Amino acid sequence: QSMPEDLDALLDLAARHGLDLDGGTLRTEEIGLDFRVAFARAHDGGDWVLRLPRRPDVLERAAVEGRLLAMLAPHLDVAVPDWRISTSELIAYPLLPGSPGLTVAADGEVSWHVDMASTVYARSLGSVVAQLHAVDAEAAAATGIEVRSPAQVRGAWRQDLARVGAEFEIAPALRERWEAWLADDGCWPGHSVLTHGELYPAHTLVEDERITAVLDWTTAAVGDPAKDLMFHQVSAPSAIFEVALQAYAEGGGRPWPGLARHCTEMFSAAPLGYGLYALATGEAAHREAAAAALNPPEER
Ligand SMILES: CC[C@H]1OC(=O)[C@H](C)[C@@H](O[C@H]2C[C@@](C)(OC)[C@@H](O)[C@H](C)O2)[C@H](C)[C@@H](O[C@@H]2O[C@H](C)C[C@H](N(C)C)[C@H]2O)[C@](C)(O)C[C@@H](C)CN(C)[C@H](C)[C@@H](O)[C@]1(C)O
Ligand SMILES: CC[C@H]1OC(=O)[C@H](C)[C@@H](O[C@H]2C[C@@](C)(OC)[C@@H](O)[C@H](C)O2)[C@H](C)[C@@H](O[C@@H]2O[C@H](C)C[C@H](N(C)C)[C@H]2O)[C@](C)(O)C[C@@H](C)CN(C)[C@H](C)[C@@H](O)[C@]1(C)O
Ligand SMILES: [Cl-]
Ligand SMILES: [Cl-]
Ligand SMILES: [Cl-]
Ligand SMILES: [Cl-]
Numbered sequence: 001q002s003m004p005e006d007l008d009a010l011l012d013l014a015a016r017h018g019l020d021l022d023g024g025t026l027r028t029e030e031i032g033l034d035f036r037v038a039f040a041r042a043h044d045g046g047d048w049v050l051r052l053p054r055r056p057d058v059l060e061r062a063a064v065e066g067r068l069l070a071m072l073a074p075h076l077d078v079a080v081p082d083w084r085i086s087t088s089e090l091i092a093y094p095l096l097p098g099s100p101g102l103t104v105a106a107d108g109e110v111s112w113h114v115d116m117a118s119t120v121y122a123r124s125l126g127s128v129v130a131q132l133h134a135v136d137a138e139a140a141a142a143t144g145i146e147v148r149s150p151a152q153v154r155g156a157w158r159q160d161l162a163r164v165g166a167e168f169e170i171a172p173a174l175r176e177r178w179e180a181w182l183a184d185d186g187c188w189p190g191h192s193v194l195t196h197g198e199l200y201p202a203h204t205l206v207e208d209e210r211i212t213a214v215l216d217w218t219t220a221a222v223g224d225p226a227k228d229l230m231f232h233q234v235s236a237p238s239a240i241f242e243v244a245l246q247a248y249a250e251g252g253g254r255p256w257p258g259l260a261r262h263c264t265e266m267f268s269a270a271p272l273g274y275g276l277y278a279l280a281t282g283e284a285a286h287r288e289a290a291a292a293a294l295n296p297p298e299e300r
Contacts, residue, residue, distance in 0.1 A: 001027040001039070010038055014050065017085045019092055021048065031106070034058040039095065047095035049081075059088060065217050066091075067143035072194075072217075075135050078128055079205075079213040096213040101201025114201055116235040119243050120209040125199075126244040128211050129228045130251025133193035137222050140194040147192070148223040154188050157269070164275035168287075169295045174271065181265040186258035193225045200231035225253070226262050233263035 004010060007023050014021050019042060026040040036052040053059055066086050073080050085092040101114045101121075114121050141147045148156060161178055164170065181187060196203070197219030205213040229248070233241050238260070245255055274290035 001029050004028040004038070010050070013052075013090055014040075014048075014092065017087065017090055017092070019048065019085065034061075035091075049093055049095050051091040053088065053091070056088070061218055062086070062091060064144040065220075068140070068145060068217055068220055071139055071143060072132075072135060076128070076131050076214075078131075078211055080217065081215065096205055096215070098205030098207045098212040101204045101206045101211075104202070112201065114206050114209050116201075116232070117237050117240050118209050119240060121206070121211070122232070122236065122240045122243040123247040124210040125229075125232055126247025126249075126253070127251050128214065129199065129225075130248050130253040132196060132214075132228065133225055134252050135194045137192065137194055140220075140222050146221040146223070148221065150189050150192055153192065153224045154182070157272075158182055160272050160276060163279070164272050164290075164294065167279060168275050168291055170271075171295045174268075174294065177265070178269050178272070181262075181269070184258070184261075186256075187262035187265060189224050189226060189262075190256065191225070191254060192222050194220065194222055195225065195227045196220055197227055198231075199228045200235075225255070226259055226266065229255075229259070230263035230267055233260050234267045 004026065007026055010026060010028075011021055011023050021040040021042055023040070026038060028039075029037040032054075034054055035058065036054060038050040038052070040048055040050070042048055051062075053062065066083050069080055069083060073082065079096050081093040081096065083091055083093045099113055102110060102112050104110050137147075161175075161182065165175065196214065196217065198216065199214070203214060203216045204211045205215070229241075229244065232244050236244070241260060245253075245259075248255060271290065271293035274286075274293050278286040278290040
């Protein structure tokens, strides 16, 4: 990244919260829509991450995330951020060790740092997800995250299809696929767990193809266990997903026979998530992108 021109203001901000940084090491990532992010070494040599809230309206999501991280860290063997400073103007935590399993460059180039056909990653993922899914769901709920029963998990997808269908044209081929998914009792979970919600390699750190930390916990919710296995299911060979499922069950996870089927159908319903986002933002650019995903053009 880059050396910021407001170095002195950033050092003052950390200093007034008790964090003394070596300004020679300070770099910033400016691309986030909700936070400005800085990395620096402290005077005692430790590496730090700084998150600067851009607007007061991001503080609610940060407060929930902070409560989740505090209660979750004792229950996972892998690392999560340890917020030693959490205020309106600064969130700061030690840099977690390891390298991201997937990085995206400034021009949009995606680079993978672990292969989805790896048995090592498959077993590491299944182990971490079983530990996460074992976390006490009532203590999870007290943090403020959303909570959905198995009944509410299925009903939310049914409602979501209806709401998106009322505001967007949906190609019949996609609508019929998703209706058949929602009608297949074999796909759907019979129990709810604490989930991450976006567990793909960009939100992990890896060492020797094993997960050593999991990041970006804003999507966490009690609900469908498959959400945390679906990205592996759609990207890994089927025998490698089965290695992940075996490690998941070995850790106390309780998969069901149609779980892999469910994962692929669910991933295909991503255009409904785009539609929901557009309706939430109201921004014309998001509505246009969701509309193109919900009603793709014909082949030529
Ligand atoms: C290459 C030269 C630079 O040195 C560095 O950059 C290294 C990271 C490291 O310096 C190198 C190089 C060397 C040869 O010392 C110069 C070596 O003996 C020390 C141990 O690490 C220094 C000692 C860091 O401090 C050490 O950061 C480590 C990550 C952890 C370590 N400790 C806590 C375990 C800690 O002491 C420190 C945090 O910068 C100390 C800080 C108080 C003073 N710095 C601002 C000075 C001025 C540095 O700019 C430097 C000396 O000019
Ligand atoms: C698993 C790998 C893929 O990762 C995914 O599919 C995510 C789960 C997906 O997200 C999925 C799942 C879901 C539920 O988003 C959470 C759905 O709404 C969207 C449409 O697709 C991402 C996060 C979407 O980015 C999200 O777009 C949403 C509309 C809003 C959301 N944020 C702003 C709130 C934003 O992060 C996005 C539109 O794909 C980002 C886009 C710019 C870049 N993609 C094209 C990359 C290359 C992806 O294909 C991927 C990295 O290869
Ligand atoms: Cl951000
Ligand atoms: Cl939230
Ligand atoms: Cl191993
Ligand atoms: Cl869910």
